[PDB]
Amino acid sequence: TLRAARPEFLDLFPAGAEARRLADGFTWTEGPVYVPARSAVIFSDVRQNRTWAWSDDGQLSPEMHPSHHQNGHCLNKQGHLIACSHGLRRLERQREPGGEWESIADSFEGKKLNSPNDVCLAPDGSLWFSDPTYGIDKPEEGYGGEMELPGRWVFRLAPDGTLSAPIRDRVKPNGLAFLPSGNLLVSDTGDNATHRYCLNARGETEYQGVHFTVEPGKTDGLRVDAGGLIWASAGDGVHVLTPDGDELGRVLTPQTTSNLCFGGPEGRTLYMTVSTEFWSIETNVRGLEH
């Protein structure tokens, strides 16, 4: 259900729009992305080592088992499915349904990655991913392992194959979302705040400061819509913020929401990974595209 902090919040949803559960029986849902070619949202259950598909015709189907504790997902420029893998400690790509998984980033300067958590596509085609240590710290969320890197970074995987780590000042970087300006937002689940960086072109960043915090809980995954509004996970649902970080309202969920994505047959459905369940609400807006 909807709780407006400002009137214009209601403009964002069709009349009588309500958050509703789509599916249950999961342990910890995460990492949803809509794949138009498959007419389905793919999402992970991180704590059950599997991924699922929710089709536009309203069917839940198993996607991958084991998934090697895949977590976050996005599409690359070509619309290939991109996964963050806790278990394999890598970023990986799937070209086609049922197709083999290809590693696209599995080490940095002779060191293993920690455990990629979330990923997003940059306007220049680069794939940016957060590398906190949840995937190797929590045995329920991966295959174990020890940290090899100096810290928990945000990586940029250039379309040509060049891997860099331009963001090294975060505690546990987690959710990532680009803004219409082409600058980047980074949620930090150690800092418990969402942070803003300017991208000085081509994989070089400058920290701008804390963009916002949320209560109750904290922002894990987040997305930005076509108008630049920020759709941010929290303890009680999704908080919708102005581009400057001011709260318009919230979509309330009975448990914590970890992540979210725009999709559906019109691109206007907001899917939410809500702990043990998977939820959606109809909106009047689409995800940002570039």
Annotated binding site for Mg(2+): 30, 117, 174, 220
Taking the C-alpha atoms of residue 179 and residue 182, their distance in angstroms, rounded to an integer, is 5
C-alpha to C-alpha distances, 106 to 49, 68, 89, 128, 131, nearest whole angstrom: 19, 14, 7, 14, 11
Q: Which residue has the tokens 């990974």?
A: 273
Query: Which pairing describes strands 184-188 and 173-178: parallel, antiparallel, or unpaired?
Result: antiparallel
Catalytic residue, candidates 191, 220, 225, 236: 220
Window 89-118: residues binding Mg ion (CB under 5 A) = 117-118
- Of 97-105, 151-159, 173-181, 235-243, the window that binds Mg ion (rule: CB under 5 A) is 173-181
Instruction: Give every strand in the sheet of 205-212, ordered side by side.
Output: 173-178, 184-188, 193-199, 205-212
Which of 199, 111, 207 lies closest to 163, judged by CA?
A: 111
Q: Which two tokens stand for residue 123?
A: 């306007």
Q: Which two tokens stand for residue 127?
A: 């794939």
Mark whether 11 is an active-site residue. Answer: no
Taking the C-alpha atoms of residue 21 and residue 69, their distance in angstroms, rounded to an integer, is 23
Which residues are documented as binding site for a divalent metal cation? 30, 174, 220
Size of the site for Mg ion (CB under 5 A): 4
Shortest separation between residue 72's beta carbon and Mg ion, angstroms:
6
Which residues are documented as binding site for substrate? 117
**Residue 290: is it exposed, middle or buried by C-beta count within 10 angstroms (0-12/13-18/19+)?**
exposed
- Of 17-25, 104-112, 215-223, 248-256, the window that binds Mg ion (rule: CB under 5 A) is 215-223
Q: Is 174 near Mg ion (CB under 5 A)? A: yes
Q: Is 45 near Mg ion (CB under 5 A)? A: no
What are the backbone dihedrals phi and psi of residue 219, each rounded to the nearest 5 degrees, phi first? -80, 120
Q: Is 220 near Mg ion (CB under 5 A)? A: yes
Q: What residues are labeled active site?
A: 220
Sites of contact with Mg ion (CB under 5 A):
117-118, 174, 220
